[PDB]
Design an enzyme around this catalytic site. Structure first.
Site, PDB file in Angstrom:
ATOM      1  N   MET A 128       0.840  -1.189   0.000  1.00  0.00           N
ATOM      2  CA  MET A 128       0.000   0.000   0.000  1.00  0.00           C
ATOM      3  C   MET A 128       0.878   1.243   0.000  1.00  0.00           C
ATOM      4  SD  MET A 128      -3.047  -0.958   2.673  1.00  0.00           S
ATOM      5  CE  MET A 128      -4.081  -2.401   2.471  1.00  0.00           C
ATOM      6  N   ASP A 129       0.608   2.159  -0.926  1.00  0.00           N
ATOM      7  CA  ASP A 129       1.313   3.433  -0.953  1.00  0.00           C
ATOM      8  C   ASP A 129       0.684   4.373   0.076  1.00  0.00           C
ATOM      9  OD1 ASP A 129      -1.059   3.911  -2.255  1.00  0.00           O
ATOM     10  OD2 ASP A 129      -0.156   4.488  -4.163  1.00  0.00           O
ATOM     11  N   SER A 130       1.018   5.661  -0.005  1.00  0.00           N
ATOM     12  CA  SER A 130       0.525   6.619   0.981  1.00  0.00           C
ATOM     13  C   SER A 130      -0.998   6.662   0.999  1.00  0.00           C
ATOM     14  CB  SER A 130       1.093   8.007   0.691  1.00  0.00           C
ATOM     15  OG  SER A 130       2.498   8.043   0.862  1.00  0.00           O
TER      16      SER A 130
END
Ligand SMILES: CCCCCCCCCCCCCCCCCC(=O)OC[C@H](COP(=O)(O)OCCN)OC(=O)CCCCCCCCCCCCCCCCC
Ligand SMILES: CCCCCCCCCCCCCCCCCC(=O)OC[C@H](COP(=O)(O)OCCN)OC(=O)CCCCCCCCCCCCCCCCC
Ligand SMILES: CCCCCCCCCCCCCCCCCC(=O)OC[C@H](COP(=O)(O)OCCN)OC(=O)CCCCCCCCCCCCCCCCC
Ligand SMILES: CCCCCCCCCCCCCCCCCC(=O)OC[C@H](COP(=O)(O)OCCN)OC(=O)CCCCCCCCCCCCCCCCC
Ligand SMILES: CCCCCCCCCCCCCCCCCC(=O)OC[C@H](COP(=O)(O)OCCN)OC(=O)CCCCCCCCCCCCCCCCC
Ligand SMILES: CCCCCCCCCCCCCCCCCC(=O)OC[C@H](COP(=O)(O)OCCN)OC(=O)CCCCCCCCCCCCCCCCC
Ligand SMILES: CCCCCCCCCCCC(=O)OC[C@H](COP(=O)(O)OCC[N+](C)(C)C)OC(=O)CCCCCCCCCCC
Ligand SMILES: CCCCCCCCCCCC(=O)OC[C@H](COP(=O)(O)OCC[N+](C)(C)C)OC(=O)CCCCCCCCCCC
Ligand SMILES: CCCCCCCCCCCC(=O)OC[C@H](COP(=O)(O)OCC[N+](C)(C)C)OC(=O)CCCCCCCCCCC
Ligand SMILES: CCCCCCCCCCCC(=O)OC[C@H](COP(=O)(O)OCC[N+](C)(C)C)OC(=O)CCCCCCCCCCC
Lengths: 64, 161, 205, 95, 78, 80, 60, 75, 506, 49
Positions: D41-43
């Site tokens: 998961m990115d930001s």
């Protein structure tokens, strides 16, 4: 150490724990609960007194 | 046709299906009105008017408290009931309206005989006041005492100060 | 000769032979069975209405669960009470009156019948243990004279002259046995032999 | 009434299902499962998951905790320690 | 006296909002009024059933007592 | 229908709805007093009816104040 | 003596519907607030009232 | 009557002495408290003796009536 | 005196400024008012004159020697209770300031005392309803005097609802009797005692049974006594019983005239159930006030057996029992209020929260009382042994006199059941004593500087500072020694109870 | 004028107002009416004397 404990301290402790656990569930602040019990008691006035022992047997069934 | 029977039939229907607190404050008013009218037309017109004078003031104070305590809870909630179980319940209830089981007392009609001895003829309220302020004056003065306690009681409960 | 055992039993009025019209056991049990099933079943469907009226309120739901009866209890309770009424009256007719043994038998059997219905998922010996306990309680209730001795109390006896208000006198001896609540200074020696029998120091050695 | 009825196994189980509905690299989620490495998961994806896990348990992550969260087990720890049932009206309890 | 003024207002508004609930309530109301007016005796017989099953002195019970006294008194003279 | 406690379904699910039931129940006692007093032509019963109405109104106010303060306790933060 | 004294004090004489204590000293209705002479159904003569049942004081 | 009032005062001394133990102070602390306590229970004791002396007089009068009532019953 | 002085106190309290000292001094004025009320009442009411029964206020009230004794008992116990709010119970401001923060506390008590004393005297159905409302309303206002407390207000809501239902039952019973007879005065109704429906009076008793917390209506009183502040619970758990039970005795005295045994059986059923619940109910509880609530339910069942038997032996049993039980109730709550000073302070598991209203809330907060204060611990042991019924304490003679009246009337079952109930309830009475003392030796040499009492300062380090205030210590000493040494004067006290008559005469 | 003396309809039909310990006894318990029927029966039995 056997039957005289069942008909003694150990047996009565289990009976007391079972009965007291039932009674602890009947103490809680709730309007509907106490209103139902008050209105239910009015049946003692309506019922003929010969039915008292049947009510007594019914109450012991509910303890179980 | 005694139309008061129909009025109480509707009121009993609406008491079973009432959901929110506003409907309950309407069941109260829907109960005092049949009482007031039936007292007016059968037994006591004095107490039909006393009921209206006192209970209405209590009703509005009751209504204004609903405004300050209404808490969104029962507008969106769901009830199940069932139309068939409601009407069947009201039918079984309507079957037995004999509050007394003395059949002769409920069936045989009676009369009273008038006399002319009471030439000093005044209203029931004058006799009630005559006894209440003379013989049962203690009852009146205790009632005054209880009304005073309520005044002090309401302040010591509600006032934050 | 019969054994001379003590008889610790509270006083009761004894019906004369030929008295005691019996009570219809089936008819009396019918009223208890039908009236209980109507109420228990009726109160069950009344509480289902309270459920439908509200199920999102935990306070109402908790109180309704305490009074809620299972399906086997809605059938078992009227049957146990009906069997109790039938067996209590049936045994009373047999014995020309009500006895603690009759009530012990009627209550334990009625309990065991009900327990085997609404306590199916428990060992059989467990149900018998409760039934013996339940039967003993009602036998004790009858032994103690139900809720009050009534006309057999000492206060009743004292009002009828069968107490000890006038005191005692040794010169007076009575052939008939004294009342249950009555005490005397001296007794006929024949009464002692009837109670104890001869032997270990009564009359002979 | 006004107390939590949460167990560590239920909170983990509900957390896994809510995380399964996302686009994660693996469906095998446990306490040690990291968000950046294991799930990927990115930001923005992480904060979509946090809010999704907020709605499921009716809890709100504080800003300090949310920025510093690494593993699935940290979320389960947070829910167990901070969850409270919502206050009910004056009639729900006493009636 | 206020129910006489309000009754037309409440009844019509009751039918408008709940025509089926009103018709069922009003239909049952009229049926019992027909029982009383036309002496169908349905409500009376239910009342006689309730008294018999609950141990009250019924109308027939009180008349049986009179007939028992009547036969007892006549033989006392004859 | 009364013996199965049908009245327990007619009472609403708020604390105020219990208050209304109490008022209605007491009002049944007063209507019975007025009915008997009028038939007997007895003013002592009507004095009793008047006392019941005044007293029943007193407890209605005392109970309301308790419920009023109970609601204030919940709304206690009052940061405004 | 102690046994005898307790027997006297603790004896409860029987009460029924024929003998019990009613604490009413005078007949009501001699005067009414108005209309004292009603239907002339008041047949009690207060000029010739028979003596009432005076209560017993055991300490007198 | 001095002997009876002597015991009542000694009861009052005991009450004060027990109180000192409750408050955890030496029994010699504020010696006037025993004098105050002793007199307070002599006063109660004197009133108590009047109460009991009255009771015996009333009991005799009631017993005479009760004996007449019992004599009628014993016939 | 009560009514006149209440009006002055009501106005005076609203005139002067609000301060803790002024409220405390106003409470002491309430103490003087009750003392003058007792002196005036004693000066005019005597047992010998009131034996016949004297009507007052157009026969609305009827005072006899049985009613008069209870009125004096109510005034005496109310004097002891006011000492709690008129003097220091602990001496520490964080605890004692609660009793001085409500200026209407003393006003409500004087309102309730008037209702308590008039209720046994009621001689008319109209005044019976009025007075039972006056007593009930004051109890609700006292239960809600601390309106900033969530539990105190919640209890008052429960109290109001249940007590209004009972009042409606009481009113419904009187309306039924008036409908039957058309009469309102009790003595007039006694003329028709054989023709009115006697179970219309059982409905009247049922409403009274709710107000004394009898089973099956015991649930609300157990809940209310545990949630209320200890100072409030001390009053409301005892005062209503002194008046209502006395009124129940008078009503049962009239009921016994017709000798309806069916009515006797229903009441015996309620007594039997209350013994079972009172004894088994307290076995599994952790709160001391919940435990005492079941103790109250059990002791009421014992008194109701004497009330049910209703004979010459019952007057002596009820009169003696109610006096000695009130003193034991006062003594126990006085000690519980005092011993909050020995509570340890933190500096945690189960997250136990203790409030200022009820510092002593659990039975195990009484731990090590045998070490902290041996004299007070013994005083609590003597009171608990009296509730158990250990001879020759006052509680033994109470059970002995109750059994005599019960067995004399043929109540064999209830006499056996109560003695079994006494044995069962001994289990939870002993648990208090186990907590007080049983760990004395394994804890005697420990350093306890973390108590509440240790927060108090010291004056000079050369003076002797008593750890408990003067008035509260003397009351505990006096009541404990009365309970312990009743054998000395038991014969004289029971001879006095012989003279208390309720239309016995001859 | 000859009229009935029955209780008001609202008393004997209102879903809530008709419920009380004495109203249930008057409606469902035969204890009261058994006693009062004895008084009525004595009237006809005592005619002969
Ligand atoms: C001048 C006439 C005034 C009345 C005309 C309107 C007729 C409607 C019913 C009037 C009273 C009949 C009995 C109702 C008792 C209260 C029960 C209630 O909740 O009100 C009924 C009304 C209908 O709402 P409904 O949609 O049908 O049901 C809810 C569905 N979830 O739900 C509502 O909340 C609407 C209520 C509006 C405000 C009514 C206030 C009460 C006024 C009563 C005065 C008359 C006294 C009663 C006379 C009839 C007795 C049955
Ligand atoms: C058109 C029909 C109208 C129906 C109206 C009744 C509504 C339905 C209610 C069901 C019936 C029960 C109530 C019946 C009346 C009350 C009891 C009674 O008075 O006795 C009547 C019935 C027959 O007895 P009977 O000998 O004829 O009467 C005396 C005559 N001299 O005696 C009986 O045997 C009745 C059966 C009672 C036994 C079952 C009840 C005990 C077990 C359930 C207990 C309920 C909960 C406990 C309540 C107390 C809680 C503390
Ligand atoms: C028609 C509705 C049902 C009738 C209810 C009757 C209420 C009034 C009767 C008096 C009892 C008052 C006690 C409080 C009422 C109990 C309320 C209730 O009914 O709840 C049932 C309660 C909960 O039990 P539980 O099985 O866990 O819950 C059901 C789960 N579905 O289960 C219980 O614990 C109930 C038992 C409470 C304890 C009562 C014991 C009284 C003494 C009985 C034995 C007498 C001792 C002497 C015996 C010798 C003589 C034979
Ligand atoms: C559960 C069952 C366990 C035992 C139940 C009781 C057995 C003990 C007993 O006394 O049995 C006797 C019983 C009937 O009892 P009884 O009244 O004595 O019979 C009439 C005698 N003429 O007879 C039986 O039917 C049992
Ligand atoms: C203040 C204490 C004063 C005690 C007065 C007791 C009393 O009321 O008198 C005895 C009373 C009979 O009185 P009577 O004969 O009717 O009238 C004339 C009597 N002079 O008989 C009674 O009926 C009294 C009934 C209640 C008795 C309660 C006993 C209380 C025990 C002492 C209380 C503890 C004292 C603690 C000290 C704290 C103060 C520092
Ligand atoms: C020589 C010495 C003589 C002295 C001894 C005198 C005492 C003799 C009495 C002995 C009977 C008690 C001893 C055995 C009881 C054991 C209780 C028990 O184990 O619980 C049984 C059951 C709960 O099941 P559970 O225990 O969890 O598991 C089953 C284990 N096989 O739950 C149950 O089935 C329990 C039954 C429900 C409760 C019934 C209540 C009946 C009424 C109360 C009984 C006492 C009556 C007292 C009345 C006055 C009280 C004030
Ligand atoms: C009537 C003929 C003579 C009988 C005399 C009285 C004997 C009573 C039995 C002994 C009980 C006892 O001693 O209570 C003490 C026991 C101690 O139990 P424990 O060993 O610590 O085990 C318990 C703990 N466990 C299992 C975890 C290790 O507490 C109990 O069980 C509590 C129940 C109390 C019931 C008391 C009722 C008494 C009724 C008496 C009449 C029937
Ligand atoms: C132990 C005492 C038992 C007595 C024997 C008995 O009572 O025997 C058992 C009885 C039998 O009585 P029955 O068969 O009805 O009468 C006998 C035949 N007659 C009619 C000719 C007399 O039945 C029962 O189970 C009753 C249970 C009794 C329990 C008592 C508890 C102890 C209380 C202590 C009192 C101080
Ligand atoms: C730390 C200490 C531990 C315990 C130590 C025990 C010390 C005992 C001291 C006793 C003093 C003494 O001797 O008192 C004796 C005196 C004088 O008796 P009398 O008037 O002649 O009566 C004659 C006594 N008969 C009948 C035995 C012959 O009566 C008293 O004062 C009574 C003591 C009060 C007890 C409480 C009940 C009375 C109050 C009534 C309220 C309802
Ligand atoms: C006619 C008969 C009675 C006569 C006396 C009665 C009033 C006494 C008041 C004196 C002043 C006072 O009490 O002064 C206060 C003192 C001392 O208090 P302390 O705790 O030592 O504080 C320390 C004081 N320093 C710091 C100055 C040292 O307290 C006492 O001595 C308490 C004794 C109270 C006796 C109560 C008797 C109750 C009887 C009840 C029967 C039902």
């Amino acid at each position: 150490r056997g039957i005289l404990q069942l008909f003694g301290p150990l047996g009565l402790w289990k009976l007391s724990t079972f009965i007291s656990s039932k009674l602890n569930k009947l103490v809680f602040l709730n309007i509907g609960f106490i209103l139902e019990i008050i209105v239910l008691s009015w049946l003692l006035i309506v019922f003929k007194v010969s039915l008292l022992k049947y009510i007594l047997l019914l109450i012991i069934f509910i303890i179980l | 046709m005694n139309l008061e029977i129909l009025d109480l039939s509707i009121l009993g229907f609406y008491s079973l299906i009432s959901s929110n607190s506003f409907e309950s404050i309407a069941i109260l008013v829907a109960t005092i009105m049949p009482v007031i009218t039936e007292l007016w037309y059968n037994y006591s017109q004095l107490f039909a008017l006393l009921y209206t004078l006192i209970y209405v003031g209590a009703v509005v104070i009751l209504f204004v408290f609903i405004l300050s305590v209404i808490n969104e809870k029962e507008e969106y909630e769901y009830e199940y009931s069932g139309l068939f179980i409601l009407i069947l319940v009201l039918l079984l209830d309507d079957l037995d309206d004999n509050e007394s089981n003395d059949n002769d007392y409920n069936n045989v009609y009676i009369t009273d005989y008038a006399d002319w001895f009471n030439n000093y003829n005044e209203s029931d309220l004058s006799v009630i006041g005559n006894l209440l302020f003379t013989e049962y004056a203690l009852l009146l003065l205790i009632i005054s005492f209880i009304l005073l306690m309520s005044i002090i009681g309401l302040i010591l409960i509600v006032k934050k100060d | 000769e019969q054994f001379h055992l003590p008889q610790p039993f509270w006083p009761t009025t004894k019906t004369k032979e030929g008295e005691y019209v019996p009570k219809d056991s089936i008819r009396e049990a019918s009223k208890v069975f039908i009236g209980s099933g109507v109420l228990l079943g009726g109160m069950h469907f009344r509480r289902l209405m309270q459920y439908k009226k509200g199920s999102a309120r935990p306070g109402l739901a908790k109180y309704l669960n305490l009074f809620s009866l299972s399906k086997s209890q809605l059938i078992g309770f009227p049957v146990a009470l009906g069997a109790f009424s039938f067996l209590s009256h049936s045994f009373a007719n047999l014995q020309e009156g009500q006895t603690a043994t009759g009530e012990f038998a009627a209550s334990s059997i009625a309990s065991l019948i009900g327990l085997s219905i609404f306590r199916t998922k428990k060992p059989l010996s467990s149900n018998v243990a409760i039934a013996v306990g339940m039967g003993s309680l009602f036998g004790f209730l009858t032994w103690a004279g139900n809720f009050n001795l009534g006309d057999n109390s000492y206060r009743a006896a004292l009002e009828a002259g069968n107490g000890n208000e006038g005191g005692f006198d040794n010169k007076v001896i009575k052939t008939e046995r004294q009342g249950f609540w009555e005490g005397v200074y001296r007794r006929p020696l024949s009464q002692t032999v009837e109670d104890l029998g001869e032997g270990r120091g009564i009359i002979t050695q | 009434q006004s107390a939590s009825t949460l167990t560590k196994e239920d909170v983990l189980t509900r957390s896994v299902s809510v995380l399964r509905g996302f686009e994660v690299k693996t469906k095998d989620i446990d306490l040690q499962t990291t968000f950046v490495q294991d799930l990927g998961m990115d930001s923005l994806d992480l904060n979509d998951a946090l809010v999704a896990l907020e709605e499921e348990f009716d809890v709100v992550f504080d800003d300090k905790t949310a920025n510093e969260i690494k593993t699935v087990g940290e979320v389960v720890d947070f829910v167990l320690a901070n969850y409270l049932p919502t206050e009910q009206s004056i009639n729900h309890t006493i009636r | 006296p206020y129910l006489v003024a309000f009754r037309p207002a409440v009844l019509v508004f009751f039918f408008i909002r709940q025509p089926i609930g009103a018709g069922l309530l009003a239909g049952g109301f009229l049926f019992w009024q027909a029982d009383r007016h036309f002496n169908f005796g349905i409500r009376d017989n239910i009342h006689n059933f309730k008294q018999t099953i609950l141990g009250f002195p019924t109308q027939a019970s009180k008349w049986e007592t009179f007939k028992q006294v009547d036969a007892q008194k006549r033989a006392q003279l004859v | 229908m009364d013996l199965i406690l049908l009245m327990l379904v007619a009472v609403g699910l708020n604390i105020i709805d219990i208050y209304i039931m109490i008022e209605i129940l007491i009002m049944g006692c007063t209507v019975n007093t007025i009915y008997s007093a009028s038939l007997d032509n007895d003013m002592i019963g009507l004095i009793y009816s008047l006392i019941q109405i005044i007293i029943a109104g007193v407890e209605s106010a005392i109970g309301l104040s308790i419920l009023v303060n109970y609601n204030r306790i919940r709304n206690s933060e009052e940061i405004e | 003596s102690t046994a005898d004294l307790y027997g006297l004090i603790s004896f409860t004489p029987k009460r029924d519907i024929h003998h019990y204590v009613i604490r009413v000293d005078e007949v009501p209705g001699k005067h009414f607030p108005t209309n004292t002479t009603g239907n002339f159904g008041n047949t009690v003569d207060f000029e010739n009232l028979e003596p009432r049942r005076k209560p017993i004081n055991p300490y007198l | 009557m001095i002997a009876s009032l002597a015991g009542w005062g000694l009861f009052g001394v005991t009450v004060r002495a027990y109180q000192q133990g409750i408050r955890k102070v030496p029994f010699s602390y504020y010696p006037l408290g025993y004098v105050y306590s002793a007199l307070g229970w002599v006063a109660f004791g004197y009133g108590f003796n009047l109460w009991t002396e009255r009771n015996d007089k009333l009991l005799e009068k009631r017993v005479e009536k009760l004996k007449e009532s019992r004599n009628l019953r014993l016939s | 005196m009560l009514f006149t002085s209440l009006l002055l106190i009501i106005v005076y309290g609203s005139l002067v400024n609000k301060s803790h000292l002024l409220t405390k001094l106003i409470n002491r004025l309430g103490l003087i008012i009750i003392i003058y009320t007792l002196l005036i009442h004693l000066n005019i009411n005597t047992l010998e004159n009131l034996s016949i029964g004297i009507n007052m206020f157009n026969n609305l009230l009827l005072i006899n020697s049985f009613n008069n004794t209870i009125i004096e008992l109510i005034l005496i116990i109310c004097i002891l209770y006011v000492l709690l709010i008129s003097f220091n119970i602990t001496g520490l401001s964080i605890i004692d300031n609660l009793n001085y923060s409500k200026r209407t506390f003393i006003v409500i008590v004087l309102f309730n005392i008037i209702g308590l004393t008039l209720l046994p005297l009621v001689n008319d159905i109209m005044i019976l309803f009025i007075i039972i409302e006056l007593q009930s309303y004051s109890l609700y206002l006292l239960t809600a005097i601390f309106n900033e407390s969530h539990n105190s207000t919640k209890s008052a809501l429960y109290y109001f609802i249940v007590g209004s239902i009972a009042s409606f039952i009481i009113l419904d019973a009187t309306v039924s009797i008036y409908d039957d007879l058309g009469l309102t005065n009790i003595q007039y109704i006694l003329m028709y005692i054989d023709k009115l429906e006697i179970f219309d009076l059982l409905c009247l008793l049922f409403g009274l049974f709710i107000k004394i917390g009898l089973a099956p209506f015991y649930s609300y009183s157990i809940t209310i006594y545990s949630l209320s502040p200890t100072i409030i619970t001390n009053y409301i758990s005892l005062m209503p019983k002194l008046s209502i039970l006395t009124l129940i005795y008078i009503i049962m005295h009239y009921i016994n005239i017709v000798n309806n045994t069916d009515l006797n059986y229903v009441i015996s059923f309620l007594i039997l159930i209350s013994m079972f619940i009172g004894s088994f109910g307290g076995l599994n509880v952790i709160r001391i006030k919940t435990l005492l609530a079941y103790s109250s339910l059990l002791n009421v069942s014992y008194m109701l057996l004497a009330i049910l038997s209703n004979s010459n032996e019952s007057i002596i049993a009820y009169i003696y029992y109610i006096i000695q039980y009130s003193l034991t109730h006062i003594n126990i709550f006085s000690i519980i209020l005092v011993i909050s000073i020995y509570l340890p302070i933190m500096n945690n598991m189960l997250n136990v929260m203790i409030t200022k209203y009820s510092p002593i809330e659990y039975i195990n907060q009484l731990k090590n009382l045998f070490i902290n204060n041996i004299f007070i611990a013994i005083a609590l042991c003597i009171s608990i042994f009296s509730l158990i019924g250990i001879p020759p304490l006052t509680g033994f003679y109470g059970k002995y006199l109750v059994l005599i009246s019960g067995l004399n009337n043929g109540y064999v079952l209830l006499s056996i059941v109560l003695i079994i109930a006494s044995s069962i309830s001994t289990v939870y009475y002993a648990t208090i004593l186990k907590v007080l003392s049983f760990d004395t030796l394994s804890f005697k040499d420990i350093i306890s500087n973390n108590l509440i009492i240790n927060t108090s300062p010291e004056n000079n380090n050369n003076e002797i500072k008593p750890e408990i205030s003067n008035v509260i210590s003397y009351v505990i000493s006096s009541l404990t020694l009365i309970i312990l040494l009743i054998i000395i004067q038991y014969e004289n006290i029971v001879k006095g109870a012989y003279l208390v008559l309720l239309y016995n005469w001859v | 004028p000859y009229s009935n003396t029955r209780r008001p309809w609202v008393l004997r039909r209102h879903i809530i107002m008709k419920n009380s310990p004495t109203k249930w006894a008057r409606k469902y318990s035969s204890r009261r009416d058994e006693r009062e029927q004895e008084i009525k029966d004595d009237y006809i039995r005592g005619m002969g004397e």
